[PDB]
Design an enzyme around this catalytic site. Structure first.
Site, PDB file in Angstrom:
ATOM      1  N   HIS A   1      20.305  37.754 108.798  1.00 15.75           N
ATOM      2  CA  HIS A   1      20.810  39.054 108.306  1.00 15.75           C
ATOM      3  C   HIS A   1      21.013  40.061 109.450  1.00 15.75           C
ATOM      4  O   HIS A   1      21.695  41.022 109.276  1.00 15.75           O
ATOM      5  CB  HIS A   1      19.925  39.695 107.172  1.00 15.75           C
ATOM      6  CG  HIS A   1      18.645  40.297 107.664  1.00 15.75           C
ATOM      7  ND1 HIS A   1      17.460  39.589 107.695  1.00 15.75           N
ATOM      8  CD2 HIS A   1      18.352  41.537 108.124  1.00 15.75           C
ATOM      9  CE1 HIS A   1      16.498  40.361 108.165  1.00 15.75           C
ATOM     10  NE2 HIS A   1      17.021  41.530 108.484  1.00 15.75           N
TER      11      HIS A   1
ATOM     12  N   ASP B   1      16.757  32.446 106.566  1.00 13.76           N
ATOM     13  CA  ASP B   1      17.290  33.668 107.175  1.00 13.76           C
ATOM     14  C   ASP B   1      17.123  33.628 108.708  1.00 13.76           C
ATOM     15  O   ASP B   1      16.576  34.528 109.335  1.00 13.76           O
ATOM     16  CB  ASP B   1      16.691  34.944 106.518  1.00 13.76           C
ATOM     17  CG  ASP B   1      17.328  36.223 107.038  1.00 13.76           C
ATOM     18  OD1 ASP B   1      18.459  36.158 107.462  1.00 13.76           O
ATOM     19  OD2 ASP B   1      16.701  37.280 107.040  1.00 13.76           O
TER      20      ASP B   1
ATOM     21  N   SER C   1      13.405  43.089 112.688  1.00 17.05           N
ATOM     22  CA  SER C   1      13.894  41.846 112.154  1.00 17.05           C
ATOM     23  C   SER C   1      14.453  40.963 113.269  1.00 17.05           C
ATOM     24  O   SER C   1      15.193  41.433 114.144  1.00 17.05           O
ATOM     25  CB  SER C   1      14.934  42.118 111.107  1.00 17.05           C
ATOM     26  OG  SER C   1      14.312  42.668 109.951  1.00 17.05           O
TER      27      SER C   1
END
Length: 195
Positions: free
Chosen positions: A45, A88, A155
């Site tokens: 992402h 992810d 992230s």
């Protein structure tokens, strides 16, 4: 989770920031060994954000005493990955000159274990990083639960256990067990001159 500031250039050699064009850190990643070469690894992402705005790999250079950045070329080829919310994770075959210009060295991937001590890194600029301490535990499928404090922006950041990477941070905490995906595996340089 003990959050500490990290001195400029004192983060692991494999760590990179992932920034928008104004410098905003919108994720993190790392250079890791994969078979006979190396790849960028980050959260899927994070790279998906590249359809929203341009992304830049960024790293602080000790020898230059400044930040360096390279635009993430959208033609770089993937090595592995999945945008499934439980994985992810994405890895990218980044050219040698990119890594050389940024001064990024490659880390090894290792399996995580139950309550392994880990460090995660992020921050708002390449020479203004922080570290958070925590523990990590695998879930027996594709993930790792961890107790490192993170912000949005972190992230894709690795959980480092010692020298090695055992996971990639995903979101509020869960990380991807990277070993699962890694099984498959004079003055100026010309790289600096061309940008």
């Amino acid at each position: 989770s003990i959050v500490s500031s990290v001195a400029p250039g004192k983060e692991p050699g494999s760590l990179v920031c992932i920034q928008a064009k104004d410098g905003k850190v919108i994720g993190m990643g790392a250079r890791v060994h994969c078979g006979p070469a190396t790849v960028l690894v980050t959260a899927g992402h994070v790279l998906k954000k590249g359809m929203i705005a341009d992304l830049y790999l960024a790293k602080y250079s000790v020898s230059s005493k400044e930040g360096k950045r390279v635009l993430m070329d959208p033609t770089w080829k993937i090595e592995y990955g999945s945008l499934n919310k439980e994985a992810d994770v994405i890895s990218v075959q980044v050219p040698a000159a990119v890594w050389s210009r940024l001064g990024v060295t490659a880390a090894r991937v290792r399996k995580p274990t139950v309550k392994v001590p880990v460090l995660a890194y992020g921050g708002e600029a390449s020479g203004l990083l922080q570290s958070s301490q925590g523990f990590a535990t695998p879930d027996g499928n594709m993930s790792v639960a961890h107790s490192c404090s993170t912000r949005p922006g972190w992230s894709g950041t690795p959980l480092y256990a010692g020298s090695d990477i055992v996971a990639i941070h995903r979101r509020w905490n869960l990380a991807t067990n990277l070993s699962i995906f890694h099984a498959n595996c004079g003055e100026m340089t010309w790289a600096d001159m061309v940008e």
